[PDB]
Structure 1
Amino acid sequence: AQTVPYGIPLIKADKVQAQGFKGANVKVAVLDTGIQASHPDLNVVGGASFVAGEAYNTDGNGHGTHVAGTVAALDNTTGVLGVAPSVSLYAVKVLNSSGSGSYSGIVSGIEWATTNGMDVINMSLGGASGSTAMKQAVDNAYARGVVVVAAAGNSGNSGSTNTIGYPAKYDSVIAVGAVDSNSNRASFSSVGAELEVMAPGAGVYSTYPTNTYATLNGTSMASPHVAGAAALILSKHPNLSASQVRNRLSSTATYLGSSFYYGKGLINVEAAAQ
């Protein structure tokens, strides 16, 4: 039987899918460690690998497969169910087996995705500094119409210190923080002016190699809920610009408290996709 992870109804993605909008023919690129394309609960239709030695459609880490499943686990009678389970899923390998990557590998994946006409780019990765090329790449992708979503960071809070990492920190990317099943901010979730919305990030169960399902914590689990939400919204209003999709998710989110810790709050896709 299929389990429905708590995050799906909490962002009310299940309400949108019942209307019949499921992300169909929206293209989503997952820029991560790759995806276990053979997993029975995922359909990967293309991608590219910027990591030496590894093909795009395998994932020795697990991280990219788990993030993909949150976006797009197939709607069927097994495994889990993704936020936008009818999306066209692309695996863009920019991180190695140990979950790490270079700026130029990352820049390359972003450019591959803009060039190959992705509608949404999910980046569940971050670092303390970013680079000149990365900034140009996210900015060029957003200006061409791509919705760009990244994990805010798992650095917690500490006084007034901004802990949002890059590429989340760039103005052209949606910085996603993490809440738990009770919709409370998870402790590891980074904080700062740039934080923009919150999604489920603690206790997220999804696809995981080999052919199984596992629970992870991090803003990395939060980011794809928003990438899936972007895809549902486009599946329902195909002509919105990236900017309008971003605004819908932003302005209709459930207020949780101070923006520094929560941004505009928890995403509500039923309200965003109205």
Structure 2
Amino acid sequence: SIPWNLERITPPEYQPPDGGSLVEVYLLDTSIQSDHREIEGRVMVTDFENVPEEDGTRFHRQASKCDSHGTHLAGVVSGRDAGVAKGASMRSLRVLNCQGKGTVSGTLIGLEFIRKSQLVQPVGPLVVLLPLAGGYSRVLNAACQRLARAGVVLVTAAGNFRDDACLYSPASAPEVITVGATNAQDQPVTLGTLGTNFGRCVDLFAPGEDIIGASSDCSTCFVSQSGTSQAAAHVAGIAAMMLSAEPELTLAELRQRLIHFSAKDVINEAWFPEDQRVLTPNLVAALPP
């Protein structure tokens, strides 16, 4: 009757009809199918684009393929039928190409564009979703830390490398809320021979396996996807809902609310390497009652 992940984040059909309406969520991702019925009118496509050229001289830039990742994530955050925060407005920036590849420099220019946009026309609290990862980057971590210090909430994917999230960015930036992925059995997600990252740089886990969301194959199509990007999108939606109910929350207070309302000790720590079990938070995100 309801996608497993929306039931999982509901404290024990998906009820909130217009959650997160005071918040604007910026998405730095691939292109999006902005006329998909699930997200039409809810996502405003900015003029921002900074992407590297695709690999392979004979690449075919089909819109359904190019838009797959970003369209699904925009749906997870604010989608009409399958979204977490159905009242949140979104603004999309294109920093990933058709193959899902971007650059640290393009991501930096995008984070700057968000701050410039805010200064020109301030609205309510902002949440920035970064469903991407690269190697540890001093400059990307610094840019995230500065935007967080300026009052903006950042949420990122822990990474899908079954490795310590501290070796990746923006996952390793302490000021960013870093999200790992769990499945319907509340266990860490396996993705081929890899899976969710773990360790002290992860703040919490959220549903990230077989997540129903908008499919760019057609204007009413839905598809299931898995990964720490989907888990981060759940936390961006939960944060938009918490900030819309309590708009005066600081970043520290919001982080405290996310931990307090999470389900505790449901993950079997045996999945993580031995030394990472005490360092990895045993928390799965949920909405407040």
After TM superposition, the score normalised by the length of structure 1 is 0.85
Indicate the residue corresponding to 1:38 in structure 2: 35
Q: Look up the equivalent residue of 1:227 and give its one-letter code.
A: A
Q: Deviation string for 1:248-270 (max 9, x for gaps)?
A: 10233222355945524101211
Instruction: Please give the alpha-carbon distance, in whole angstroms, between the structure 2 residues aligned to 1:149 and 1:264.
Output: 18
Structure 1: give runs of 5+ residues left out of the alignment.
Answer: 75-79
Q: Deviation string for 1:155-181 (max 9, x for gaps)?
A: 115xxx566521011111111000111
Decide whether aligned partners of structure 1 residues 264 and 87 sit closer, same or farther in structure 2, where only a CA change above 3 A counts. same
Indicate the residue corresponding to 1:197 in structure 2: 204
Q: Identity over the aligned pairs, expressed in percent?
A: 29
Indicate the residue corresponding to 2:56 in structure 1: none
Instruction: Please give the alpha-carbon distance, in whole angstroms, between the structure 2 residues aligned to 1:264 and 1:227.
Output: 19
Q: 1:5-44 to 2 correspondence within 5 Å?
A: 5-12=3-10, 17-18=15-16, 22-42=19-39, 43-44=42-43
| 2:121 corresponds to 1:123 | no
Q: 1:18-167 to 2 correspondence within 5 Å?
A: 18=16, 22-42=19-39, 43-51=42-50, 60-74=66-80, 80-117=81-118, 119-132=126-139, 134-157=140-163, 165-167=168-170
Q: Deviation string for 1:221-266 (max 9, x for gaps)?
A: 1000000000000111111122211221023322235594552410
Aligned match of 2:287 in 261, 269, 272?
269
Runs of 4+ in structure 1 displaced over 6 angstroms? 13-16
Larger Cα-atom Rg: 2
Instruction: Please give the alpha-carbon distance, in whole angstroms, between the structure 1 residues aligned to 2:73 and 2:67.
Output: 12
Instruction: Please give the alpha-carbon distance, in whole angstroms, between the structure 1 residues aligned to 2:71 and 2:157.
Output: 16
**Greater mean deviation of Cα atoms: 196-205 or 210-219:** 210-219
Instruction: Please give the alpha-carbon distance, in whole angstroms, between the structure 1 residues aligned to 2:3 and 2:167.
Output: 26
Contact 1:154–1:190 (CA under 8 A) maintained in structure 2: yes
Contact 1:124–1:224 (CA under 8 A) maintained in structure 2: yes
Secondary structure of the equivalent of 1:205? strand
Aligned match of 1:218 in 227, 236, 241?
227
Indicate the residue corresponding to 1:248 in structure 2: 257
**Greater mean deviation of Cα atoms: 262-271 or 207-216:** 262-271
Secondary structure of the equivalent of 1:135? helix
CA drift at 1:101: 0.3
Secondary structure of the equivalent of 1:116? helix
Contact 2:50–2:94 (CA under 8 A) maintained in structure 1: yes
CA drift at 1:4: 3.8
Indicate the residue corresponding to 2:174 in structure 1: 171
Instruction: Please give the alpha-carbon distance, in whole angstroms, between the structure 1 residues aligned to 2:288 and 2:209.
Output: 22
More strand per residue: 1 or 2?
2
In the alignment of these two chains, the number of paired residues is 257
Instruction: Please give the alpha-carbon distance, in whole angstroms, between the structure 2 residues aligned to 1:30 and 1:98.
Output: 17
